[PDB]
Amino acid sequence: FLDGIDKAQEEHEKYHSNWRAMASDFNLPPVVAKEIVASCDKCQLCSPGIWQLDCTHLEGKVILVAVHVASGYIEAEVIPAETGQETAYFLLKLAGRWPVKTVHTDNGSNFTSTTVKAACDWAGIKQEVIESMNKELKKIIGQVRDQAEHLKTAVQMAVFIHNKKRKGGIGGYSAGERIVDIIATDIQT
Amino acid sequence: FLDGIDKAQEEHEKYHSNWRAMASDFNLPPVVAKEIVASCDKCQLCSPGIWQLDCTHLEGKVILVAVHVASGYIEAEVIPAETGQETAYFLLKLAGRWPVKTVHTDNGSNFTSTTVKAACDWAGIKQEGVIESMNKELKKIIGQVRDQAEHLKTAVQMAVFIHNKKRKGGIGGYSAGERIVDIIATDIQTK
Ligand SMILES: [K+]
Ligand SMILES: [K+]
Ligand SMILES: [Zn+2]
Ligand SMILES: [Zn+2]
Known part of the structure; x- marks a missing residue:
């Protein structure tokens, strides 16, 4: 799933999707999806x-x-x-x-x-x-x-x-x- | 459906609905809805x-x-x-x-x-x-x-x-x- 991480990050950078969305859309373990949200300055979990x-x-x-x-x-x-x-x-x-x-x-x-x-x-x-x-x-x-x-x-x-x-x-x-x-x-x- | 004829005619003055729409929307026979369009000076069948x-x-x-x-x-x-x-x-x-x-x-x-x-x-x-x-x-x-x-x-x-x-x-x-x-x-x- 390591390739999907960069895709999910671009998705979130535009739309700021929540972690359940990114986990499901890009086949990411929830732990990774949540780190994208937690890293983002505009969002919280x-x-x-x-x-x-x-x-x-x-x-x-x-x-x-x-x-x-x-x-x-x-x-x-x-x-x-x-x-x-x-x-x-x-x-x-x-x-x-x-x-x-x-x-x-x-x-x-x-x-x-x-x-x-x-x-x-x-x-x-x-x-x-x-x-x-x-x-x-x-x-x-x-x-x-x-x-x-x-x-x-x-x-x-x-x-x-x-x-x-x-x-x-x-x-x-x-x-x-x-x-x-x-x-x-x-x-x- | 006779009462629907005046309603469809009033709506056509506004929307100029085609005959299929008036037939469906007002439960009019196609032949009746077609007349309404033919009577309208701004439309034509x-x-x-x-x-x-x-x-x-x-x-x-x-x-x-x-x-x-x-x-x-x-x-x-x-x-x-x-x-x-x-x-x-x-x-x-x-x-x-x-x-x-x-x-x-x-x-x-x-x-x-x-x-x-x-x-x-x-x-x-x-x-x-x-x-x-x-x-x-x-x-x-x-x-x-x-x-x-x-x-x-x-x-x-x-x-x-x-x-x-x-x-x-x-x-x-x-x-x-x-x-x-x-x-x-x-x-x-x-x-
Ligand atoms: K955050
Ligand atoms: K006409
Ligand atoms: Zn965000
Ligand atoms: Zn007309």
Whole structure:
């Protein structure tokens, strides 16, 4: 397995995967996988149509985060300002991407604006986890901020890592694999 | 299904859904759904990891388009400038939500820039008419809905919505968005 050690180290240097991930992906003894994490300075050892939206802030920038409740898959974007126009545009992209039937926000004046109500009307979305998810997202951003000049890039690096490089559960899937399985199954029924 | 006729007709004013989608979505006989389209003045009756990318232009603005070859699924955005930075950011966003293993593109200034190559290396993507046909259909759909939006930005996402969700066909009567989810889900089962 000695060849896999350099591969796992490059994997962790980009995505900061945990030791179970590296042990399984690169056929490493757990003792070796844990040493990669311990050596790293940045680390230590529902219905399918429901989404949650919230705005969080980092480095004086607004990050719009959507979470597929049933899977944990997230989409996020740095927006120029916390406005309903930016939220409506965001919802319209998401809605053409996945089956978005219901969206849960706080009563933020961006989520209650008429521009957003107009967007949900057009896209056929009803309006009516995310906090624990902003925490996890900001954690990943911190691990990778050094790899990006601008925050917007780090944010998208973090989303990539959460959806694809953070596996778990009975199936051992990532959140990206889960949402695809959940929606694909919902089609068949 | 007689009550569904007014609902489908109302939705077609908005999405301009093809007849297969209205028949499926509203439980209308094909012959009824076909009439709705005929009445409309604006209408008329490989590995899962492979994507194509190109820029197309409309109203003096730049639209970056990504096509999932195996399914016909599309993502598209109006970008502020044909630059490697904006293309790389688009690339990083796409790879976070789908399995992007290979991206076919032109050898132009933008898609061969070092910034785009940096994004591909970080995300595990390797670089290497379908895009032309999707460009003309997307531009065609944007034409049908352009009056519903102030800015081209919104009309583009409306067109992407319509193309992925409201244009069904084939054996299962799937949309392009249902086909990509089905194709990727099947790839997971095999792997
Ligand atoms: K450590
Ligand atoms: K017609
Ligand atoms: Zn680390
Ligand atoms: Zn029409």
